[PDB]
Structure 1
Amino acid sequence: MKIAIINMGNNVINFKTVPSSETIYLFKVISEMGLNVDIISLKNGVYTKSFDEVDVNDYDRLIVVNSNLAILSAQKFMAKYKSKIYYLFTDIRLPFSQSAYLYTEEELLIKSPIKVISQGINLDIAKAAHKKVDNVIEFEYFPIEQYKIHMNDFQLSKPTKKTLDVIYGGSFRSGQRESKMVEFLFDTGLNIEFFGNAREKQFKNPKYPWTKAPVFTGKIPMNMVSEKNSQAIAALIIGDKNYNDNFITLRVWETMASDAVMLIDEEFDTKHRIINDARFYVNNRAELIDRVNELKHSDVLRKEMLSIQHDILNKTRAKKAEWQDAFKKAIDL
């Protein structure tokens, strides 16, 4: 049984960009499952083989991720593949999709059936997002994002000195989460830092007025996110509208593993699936401020909440074998 992983829109070579790093970490976890796997990309190197040096059909299972040469090559490669394509649906804004003088569609048209492995539990949302796909398509839920906590070298963050009140790391996401970012992170009167690719100048929509913004700092490597989260008393979990009561995102685990107390927007998880404890949830800005002040003022509460969230994380890690079994079942092995 031979498996190939391709990133449909980004080049994979090193840990320099985020889309390249998650493909390599996905590749690492699948390898640690005891599977023979290769990443196919633009060039040959320590982590990859080139599209030109392999025969797509030598692979029994083709896994496709997403996060222009990379886009044109992957399509030509997939267009020649004669079996089912397993698409990892990890971001609502990136459903599977078919992308001029240099191109013929008989060379780029993908006719294979596609199995969408949705990171969100609500398959109707995944189906609605893939409405335009002409292909034969099937859907299945798999919590792909747990890959980080199941890696062999995973470890919780240690207690660290606090220099911030609340931290959130991420990008602007085309303004898809602007109302939520402004509500929980702007005008709080607290010491907040927003790290990642966002900038203050992007927050320009007149519908969400604000006076003072959080401090914006640059991006950091994926493997340093929990350590960065750890410099704060609390770290925020918010999501796009279609992630609510649907997607558990990577930040949930990155935060849970950190030394920062995880504070979750109520609307993201109304049933309280993540942690069945109301102390970890906030409905709005007023509640976030009060919760952060309670945590800054009672070490007994902060330590208890950290202890509880680390316990939930360890409980989940304890099921690594079942998680690995389900992933193999999802890819028909």
Structure 2
Amino acid sequence: MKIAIINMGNNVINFKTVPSSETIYLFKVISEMGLNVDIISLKNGVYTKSFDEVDVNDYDRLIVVNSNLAILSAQKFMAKYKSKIYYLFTDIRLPFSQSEEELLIKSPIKVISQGINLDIAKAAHKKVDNVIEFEYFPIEQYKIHMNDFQLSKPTKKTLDVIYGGSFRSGQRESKMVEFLFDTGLNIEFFGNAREKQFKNPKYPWTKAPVFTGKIPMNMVSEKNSQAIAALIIGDKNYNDNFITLRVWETMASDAVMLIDEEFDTKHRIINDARFYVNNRAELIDRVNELKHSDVLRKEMLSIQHDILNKTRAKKAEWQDAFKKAIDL
């Protein structure tokens, strides 16, 4: 059984970019499952093999992630594969889609949805003509199942709330402004967003949080740990659907995880109302409570790390479910 992983939109080579990084981490966790795996990209290197140095049909399973030569190359390569393509649907904005006959992909496609609501995964892929089947699998838990995963230790607090990410093309501007702007709290927004991007008239604000630059994927939980709390919000279609990597990066940190009620109305992540907030007012009160009650803050951290540990204790079941999802 030989498996190959391709990144459809970006060149994979190092841990410089987030797309290249998450691809090497998937590869790492899949390898640690005891599977013979290769990443195919533009160049041969210490992590990758080039498209021209391999025969697409030597692989029994072809896994595709998404995050231009890399695109053209991947399409051309996939177009020659004679079996089913397993697409990891990790971002609602990145469903599978085709880029004339040398690029036309005719193979059936299995979309492994990170979101539990398969109707949303279907609607996003409605323009796909290929035979396509859907299945849910919590792909994002790959970070916590990695062999060298370590929980973040107690850190000195220099911030109240923190959030790391990008602007997502304004996909969640409403929520960012509601919870991170004009709170009168000491907030930091790290990543690719910039204050200037928040120009939508529908969401007025007076004072913005502090925008700092992006950090490596492997530094996120350590960065989150500088604050009392770290916020979990999502796009509209993530609500009650996707559990994102930020949930685990936050849960593993020394920052108490505060979740937008709308993101998880059933309280699937943690069945404890103290971790959820409905609006800006509740976020403020909740952070003030945490700042002034160490017993509370420490109790909540202990509860979230516990949940994290119980999930990590089901690694074998997670690995099996992954193998089954790729027809093994």
* Distance in 2 of aligned mates of 1:204 and 1:84: 44
Q: Match of 2:307, SS?
A: helix
Q: Tell me the SS of whatever aligns to 1:276.
A: coil
Over 4 Å off, 4+ runs: none
Q: Deviations 1:8-39 (Å, cap 9, x if unpaired)?
A: 00000000000000000000000000000000
Alpha-carbon separation, structure 1, partners of 2:101 and 2:120: 31
Identity percentage of aligned residues? 100
The Cα RMSD (Å) is: 0.2
* Unpaired segments ≥5 residues, structure 1: 100-104
CA distance in 2, matches of 1:15, 1:207: 38
1:184 Cα offset (Å): 0.1
In structure 2, C-alpha distance between the alignment counterparts of 1:23 and 1:326, rounded to whole Å: 20
Q: Could you say what secondary structure the match of 2:161 adopts?
A: strand
Counterpart-to-counterpart distance in 1, 2:103 and 2:324? 29
Counterparts of 2:170 and 2:97 in 1: how far apart (Å)?
Answer: 22
**Distance (Å, rounded) in 1 between the aligned partners of 2:67 and 2:180:** 25
d(CA) in 2 for partners of 1:315, 1:68: 42
Q: Name the CA distance, whole Å, in 2 between partners of 1:67 and 1:18.
A: 9
Q: Deviations over 1:62-118 (max 9, x none)?
A: 00000100000000000000000000000000000001xxxxx11000000000000
Cα distance in 2 for residues equivalent to 1:252 and 1:309: 10
Tell me the distance in 2 between the aligned counterparts of 1:149 and 1:80: 35
> 2 CA distance for matches of 1:320 and 1:7?
25
SS of equivalent to 2:37: strand
Matched residue, 1:102: none
Distance in structure 2 (CA, Å) of the matches to 1:306 and 1:325:
30
Aligned length: 328
Q: State the 1:199 CA deviation.
A: 0.2
Superposed displacement of residue 188, structure 1:
0.0
Q: Please give the alpha-carbon distance, in whole angstroms, between the structure 2 residues aligned to 1:135 and 1:181.
A: 37
> Does residue 281 of structure 1 match 2:287?
no
Whole-angstrom CA distance in 1 between matches of 2:57 and 2:22: 24
CA distance in 1, matches of 2:137, 2:20: 21
In 1, Cα distance between the equivalents of 2:67 and 2:298? 36
CA deviation digits over 1:176-210, x for unaligned, max 9?
00000000000000000000000000000000000
> What's 1:77 paired with?
77
* Residue 148 of structure 1, CA deviation: 0.1
How far does the alpha carbon of each residue in 1:212-254 deviate from its partner, in whole angstroms, 9 at most, with x for none? 0000000000000000000000000000000000000000000
Unaligned runs of 5+ in 2: none
Q: Give the whole-Å Cα distance in 1 for the aligned partners of 2:125 and 2:21.
A: 26
1:166-315, aligned counterparts within 5 Å? 166-315=161-310
| Matched position secondary structure for 2:110 | strand
C-alpha distance in 2 between matches for 1:229 and 1:192 = 11
What is the distance in 2 between the residues matched to 1:288 and 1:319?
32
Q: For 1:87 and 1:295, locate their aligned partners in 2 and report how far apart those are by CA, in whole Å.
A: 41
State the secondary structure of the residue aligned to 1:57: helix
Q: TM-score, with normalisation over the residues of structure 1? A: 0.98
State the 1:163 CA deviation.
0.1
Distance between the aligned counterparts of 2:166 and 2:67, measured in 1? 13
Give the alignment's TM-score, normalised by structure 2. Answer: 1.00
